[PDB]
């Protein structure tokens, strides 16, 4: 009663009735989501009631994670317009810095990828992570490019 359950990498939770819980449940002031069909902890991008998250073992994550349309700034609670904890939020035409990761979002609130030019500064964003290369020589498209730790490219001719 009233504890979690790890079983073959699956995660569950049982309430005071010894029954596995499904849907949103507030455990220790945190919200988890469990699949209605199987009850396992949620995993991966999961649109829900018009609010998009990115679950890992049933706990919404913070940061940038690819979805059906691309990457999104899944942000902490009350970061923009009373958004829930980890809900995807509108983030257009401005940079995002996160654990030393510098993301850039376009007008549609999706993180750009590959080469970009912003305010006269040329950037590059790793396609598989959208992380903006920064801080030393990088091997891109079979060449060499040097980016300052702000991420801005260095011409170097």
């Amino acid at each position: 009663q009233n504890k979690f359950l790890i079983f073959n990498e699956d995660v569950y939770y049982f309430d005071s009735s010894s029954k596995a819980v499904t849907g949103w449940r507030t455990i220790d002031d945190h919200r988890f989501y469990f699949e209605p069909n199987t009850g396992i902890g949620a995993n991966g991008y999961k649109t829900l009631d018009g609010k998009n998250f990115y679950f890992r073992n049933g706990l919404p994550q913070f940061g940038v994670f690819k979805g059906p349309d691309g990457f999104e700034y899944f942000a902490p609670a009350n970061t923009h317009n009373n958004n829930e904890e980890g809900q995807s939020i509108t983030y257009q035409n401005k940079f995002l810095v996160f654990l030393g990761n510098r993301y850039y979002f376009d007008s549609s609130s999706k993180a750009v990828t590959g080469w970009q030019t912003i305010n006269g500064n040329t950037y590059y964003f790793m396609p598989d992570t959208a992380i903006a290369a920064a801080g030393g020589f990088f091997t891109i498209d079979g060449a060499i490019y040097f980016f300052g730790i702000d991420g801005v490219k260095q011409p170097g001719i």
Partner: protein, 341 residues
């Protein structure tokens, strides 16, 4: 006169206690005569260690300087540093050495239990994000970019110590962080002064698997290319993730005049930053080892050199990693511990 005429500092790899002399503008040692454990405890408490006291004893003077802040007895129940006064030379022929905390001792590929007892893993939303380094029972060193802007509440973080397997870091079993302190100078772009203090809500219990790592004392004389070690959960394989196991990799320091060259970083590295790669590559830090400890062994004690900042290939050397200079921030660390007391 609290930001000068009351400042004490341990010195060297031998922990030689010193007191600042405003009259001559110098750091001086203290003669061993008249000295006992009580004044050692006072000097430790002043240095922000609160109740941590390990050992004090006299050691034959080796620095060679001829001057001492001699203690008084008949001054009355006054400030300890109201008494220490100058003298040409004492008759005890011994200067004081004072250790405020037992640290820098570990048990004698993956790392075995109790080999890096000072390593911790920080969990933002049940996922390993940054490492750390124990310095006292209730203080952990890490990076400022780990706890910046969006992620800055102490309620987001949680720490795990003495556990080697990421799979074994359960939910609700870590230590809750009751405060997050980033360096005021920290610049989000250049990441200069990238160091943060994360005070736990409850003290860490120290055992064979959990132990502090000593801070760098002034006057250590780092050789041009040391033999350090780097620990943390990452991925030796590139295109990887948080490793299931804690690893450790021998690394070699790199001179800042070489690491700022134009084949390496072209002046990206500031005075508060340190490089430690490994020739032939095949070993360096990696993701999840950001905010982890870089340590060395000198004079039989494990010292903390820095913490991870950033890199450009991470085991693709000729673009090695970078760590913040713990020695340069040690005074701010002491001040933050002191004020919290």
């Amino acid at each position: 006169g609290e930001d000068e005429n009351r400042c004490v500092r341990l010195y060297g790899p031998n922990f030689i206690l010193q007191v600042y002399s405003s009259q001559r503008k110098s750091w001086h040692p203290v003669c061993q005569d008249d000295w006992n454990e009580n004044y050692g405890r006072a000097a430790c408490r002043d240095m922000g260690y609160k109740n941590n006291f390990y050992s004090s004893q006299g050691i034959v003077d080796d620095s060679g300087s001829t001057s001492f802040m001699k203690l008084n007895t008949s001054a009355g129940n006054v400030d300890i540093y109201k008494k220490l006064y100058h003298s040409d030379a004492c008759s005890s022929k011994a200067v004081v050495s004072l250790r405020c905390i037992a640290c820098g001792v570990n048990l004698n590929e993956s790392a075995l239990p109790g080999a890096w007892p000072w390593q911790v893993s920080l969990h933002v939303q049940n996922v390993h994000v940054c490492g750390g380094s124990i310095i006292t029972p209730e203080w952990i060193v890490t990076a400022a970019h780990c706890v910046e802007k969006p992620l800055n509440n102490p309620w987001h973080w949680t720490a795990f110590a003495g556990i080697l397997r990421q799979s074994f870091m359960f939910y609700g079993a870590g230590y809750q962080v009751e405060k997050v302190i980033s360096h005021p100078n920290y610049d989000s772009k250049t990441k200069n002064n990238d160091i943060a203090l994360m005070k736990l809500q409850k003290p860490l219990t120290f055992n064979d698997l959990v132990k502090p790592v000593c801070l760098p004392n002034p006057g250590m004389m780092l050789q041009p290319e040391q033999l350090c070690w780097i620990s943390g959960w990452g991925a030796t394989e590139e295109k990887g993730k948080t490793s299931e196991v804690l690893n450790a990799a021998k690394v070699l320091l790199i001179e800042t005049q070489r690491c700022n060259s134009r084949y390496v970083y072209d002046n990206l590295i500031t005075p508060a930053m340190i490089c430690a790669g490994f020739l032939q590559g095949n070993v360096d830090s990696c993701q999840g080892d950001s905010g982890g400890p870089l340590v060395t062994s000198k004079n039989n004690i494990w010292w903390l050199i820095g913490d991870t900042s950033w890199g450009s290939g991470c085991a693709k050397a000729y673009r090695p990693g970078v760590y913040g200079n713990v020695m340069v921030f040690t005074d701010w660390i002491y001040r933050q511990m002191r004020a919290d007391g």
